[PDB]
Symmetry: C3
Subunit: 230 residues, 3 copies
């Protein structure tokens, strides 16, 4: 394939596929209805990402957008991936602390705005406008992280000790992990164009694998996903 970033797309596809298979096997026989929910959510995430990375690898999840007087390749499939995987990851965190339905709707709604406006910015042909959308997208991200930090941390400390501790780790990972995305966008070819596309693709692949496989390995090795029973 005549795209230098192909190597990072192939590696990402393989790792998401292997992650999906592992979770699928690990989840066999689990009957606790609570654990079944976490396994369903956490296995679906890398299965979706697998299909999206494959679509980028084969060239389908790519388009050309003119801005800055040039044809810029844009992997729109990245955003389709995040559109579906980020709300599932939020659902994992919300179920852990038994968040109320009102707060879940707020987080998922803000997440849709986050990804939707990011996509609009990626496809926008007026260069200066691209960063208006980036700003709105990042504001929605900060609202999410505010809720996860100050909204959820209070509900967790009153819960089981294994629920409060697992959430604390997954929360710190999320804040650091989520916050890198808008930075890579700003410095890569969709934004300021300081880092070339092949390195931009590597950085998003490292982040995506950490979030869609790494995060799941941490959650599914915790005792919190099971109900307290004899």
């Amino acid at each position: 394939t005549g795209r230098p970033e192909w190597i990072w797309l192939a590696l990402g596809t393989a790792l998401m596929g292997l992650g999906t298979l592992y979770f699928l096997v690990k989840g066999m026989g689990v009957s606790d209805p609570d654990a079944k929910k976490f396994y369903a959510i956490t296995t679906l995430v890398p299965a979706i990402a697998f299909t999206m990375y494959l679509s980028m690898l084969l060239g389908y999840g790519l388009t050309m957008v003119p801005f800055g007087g040039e044809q810029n390749p844009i992997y729109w499939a990245r955003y389709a991936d995040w559109l579906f995987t980020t709300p599932l990851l939020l659902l994992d965190l919300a179920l852990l602390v038994d968040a109320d339905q009102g707060t879940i709707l707020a987080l998922v709604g803000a997440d849709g705005i986050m990804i939707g406006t990011g996509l609009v910015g990626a496809l926008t042909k007026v260069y200066s406008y691209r960063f208006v959308w980036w700003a709105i997208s990042t504001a929605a991200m900060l609202y999410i992280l505010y809720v996860l930090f100050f909204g959820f941390t209070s509900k967790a400390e009153s819960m089981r000790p294994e629920v409060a501790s697992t959430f604390k780790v997954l929360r710190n990972v999320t804040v650091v992990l989520w916050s890198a995305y808008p930075v890579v966008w700003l410095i890569g070819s969709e934004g300021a164009g300081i880092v070339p596309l092949n390195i931009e693709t590597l950085l998003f692949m490292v982040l995506d694998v950490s979030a869609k496989v790494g995060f799941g390995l941490i959650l599914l090795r915790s005792r919190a996903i099971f109900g307290e029973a004899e």
Copy 2:
């Protein structure tokens, strides 16, 4: 900007943004889980509309459709906005009367058909076919309003007095408000072409602000959104 309707798009963007901020502040500190749901729903609505109005203002939410032997500008972002905000508004009404899950699925499903077929009609290149889709869309709207009037009014009179009264007002507003949309479509440039695009845009902006901010001001000033407690 070289579009005469730009003024109405700028005004709509500003009003949705101001409405979102107001609701966001008003909702701070609210802890009653019932009120949290209404604030989550009712704040998300104008935040979505804000992004959609901005996308029309900057030119992204617009396309050209040939029919009647002319290039007709179509603001497809209007429909993307309604696709997400009208089911949230229905959820507000359904939660108020504690509607059963079966009736909610019917309303949301009929609402998706309503907006989906309206979009198809807006993008249809055969002029006469456009009104076939308008007719199907309007039939789905009448089903919704039938349920809100005859379906829900019975469940409300048995509920708390502040729930029955709030719903009655929001119901009358909804019937009048919702019914104007297909009329403006039919008379504006998407339909018969009697009213020019700049006035059509003004009329939809007046309606959208009434529905996405106005409606919310009425709901969130009612006692019905809180649980009965000491």
Copy 3:
């Protein structure tokens, strides 16, 4: 209309419309909240299919895709139809056996992958890649059917006798019905090109009517949809 398959599109539109009307009338007056859910789900299915078949009939739900050195007409509206109707049909089956929330999320998620990857394969311009997507789509289908057969059959035998029997019939129909779809795709013009488009359209219309009207007639004539009451 200058497309020989138009006759099968017109017939499909009519049958979905008639099916929608029948279910709509049959459901009048039903007040049992459990039966209301099944009627809501089962009436929405053919109403969606009606709009999609109409969009194919009028030419809107069609596009041209170059592969094998030819312009191949692709009815993308088929996939939009299935995207919404197949998860509703799964919800019908899941509610019948009172499946847990974890298993429902798994089935609906796998169903979205099934249809999404099928659509990608239909729109893919590299001929050999089309069948890669077909393979992934079919694997997701087999996971669904595995769960319906081995996952759900165990939960049903412990339920009411009228619930276990109704599900058994709807399960056998589903396995045979669902499995024909990937076969028709492979042999028709989207795949190997052995069967011409007009016969391919007939076969999918026969299948769609069986699934979106036939299946519903079986379910809504069963006692299982009502709660056990005096």
